[PDB]
């Protein structure tokens, strides 16, 4: 009977509703706004986690680490543009050497 | 000659692109971005859009020129413009 | 006493890679990411409501904010998921 | 394609570059600059019409452009 289950989500619709109400965003919060927002957040984390799990699998590992998150983000142009001004701790850099270097 | 042209342009403030061509360009971009519903444009909306575009382009040219000088040239190249966009970094250069 | 989206991120991870785990630091990064995106979208929706002299943040502001913040292909599927969820929710 | 992007003429682009202080301009700079201006306008116009149709309007207002620029990180002042 939870709103998350009723909407088919794994993210907490009630918690998002409370955060919207308590965050000084507007006086009132519609009923579908937390549902929409939770769906969007769940979709975004699903995308990131899928790419990161693939990056970890390609490294022959079964645990995602900040390095894998960084590899997943900086290799998808959409996510790379979304998280443009974001620094990931312990993420390193992409293995990119200029072409004039390698002889 | 170019020197007096630069000195004359850098003390003026009027827009350098022609309003009607700019308006046509903006409108055709808008109709490419539409979802089957056409829009109108306040005269001030197009002036605002052109004031921002020209300022953006002028600043971009200033940066690109610094790159030209760094390379030892006095002639601005497309690679100097492309690199200035890359250093500005995906939101300021775009 | 300190609420975290760790359990939900873990559920989504189990859905998408049923046999992969996630480190604690990576989970903290995922929590930072969710909070950051939530704040972005909510702030934009607030600004929209204030621009239109409205006092309510509805699912229409969330959709428009998603369209403004997310790059194109991301935003398409994001609004797909959002409208799908609100339909499934109002259908009950 | 025939026009509307060629409306941004070489003398106009040259005036922009001279105000920027460029002393000497190559010939491929014109096509480069037309492309840059196009991609700049596409980003701002998209957001402007997004605002404009979130409000249930059909006219792109100056404030819609101002909000689009402000959200993209460029604040414009003469149109409040």
């Amino acid at each position: 009977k939870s709103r998350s289950s009723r909407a088919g989500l794994q993210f907490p619709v009630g918690r998002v509703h409370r955060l919207l109400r308590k965050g000084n965003y507007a006086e009132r919060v519609g009923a579908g706004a937390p549902v929409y927002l939770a769906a969007v957040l769940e979709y975004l984390t699903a995308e990131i986690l899928e790419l990161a799990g693939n990056a970890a699998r390609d490294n022959k590992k079964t645990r995602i680490i900040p390095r894998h998150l960084q590899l997943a983000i900086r290799n998808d142009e959409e996510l790379n543009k979304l998280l443009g001004r974001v620094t990931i701790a312990q993420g390193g850099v992409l293995p990119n050497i200029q072409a004039v270097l390698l002889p | 000659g170019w020197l007096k042209e630069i000195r004359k342009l850098q003390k003026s403030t009027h827009l350098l692109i022609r309003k009607l061509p700019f308006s046509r360009l903006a409108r055709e971009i808008c109709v490419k971005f539409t979802r089957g519903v056409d829009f109108n444009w306040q005269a001030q909306a197009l002036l605002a859009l052109q004031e921002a575009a020209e300022a953006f382009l002028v600043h971009l040219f200033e940066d690109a020129y610094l790159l030209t000088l760094h390379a030892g040239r006095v002639t601005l190249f497309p690679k100097d413009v492309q690199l200035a966009r890359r250093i500005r970094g995906l939101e300021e250069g775009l | 006493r300190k609420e975290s989206y760790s359990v939900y991120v873990y559920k989504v991870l189990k859905q998408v890679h049923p046999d992969t785990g996630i480190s604690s630091k990576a989970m903290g990064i995922m929590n930072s990411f969710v909070n950051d995106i939530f704040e972005r979208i909510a702030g934009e929706a607030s600004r929209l409501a204030h621009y239109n002299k409205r006092s309510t943040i509805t699912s229409r502001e969330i959709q428009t904010a998603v369209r403004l913040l997310l790059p194109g292909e991301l935003a398409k599927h994001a609004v797909s998921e959002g409208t799908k969820a609100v339909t499934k929710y109002t259908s009950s | 394609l025939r026009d509307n992007i060629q409306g941004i003429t070489k003398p106009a682009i040259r005036r922009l570059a001279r105000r920027g202080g460029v002393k000497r301009i190559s010939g491929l700079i014109y096509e480069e600059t037309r492309g840059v201006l196009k991609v700049f306008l596409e980003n701002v116009i998209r957001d402007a019409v997004t605002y404009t149709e979130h409000a249930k309007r059909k006219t792109v207002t100056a404030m819609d452009v101002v909000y689009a620029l402000k959200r993209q990180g460029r604040t414009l002042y003469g149109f409040g």
């Binding site: 899928e50 142009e77 996510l79 | 690199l83 | - | -």
Partner: peptide, 21 residues
């Protein structure tokens, strides 16, 4: 190329500073 669960092709950020034609 590379497609996710949804039909979202996640292209890699090749190059954007260069104008197209």
């Amino acid at each position: 190329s590379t497609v996710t669960k949804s039909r979202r092709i996640s292209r890699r950020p090749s190059d954007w500073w260069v104008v197209k034609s």
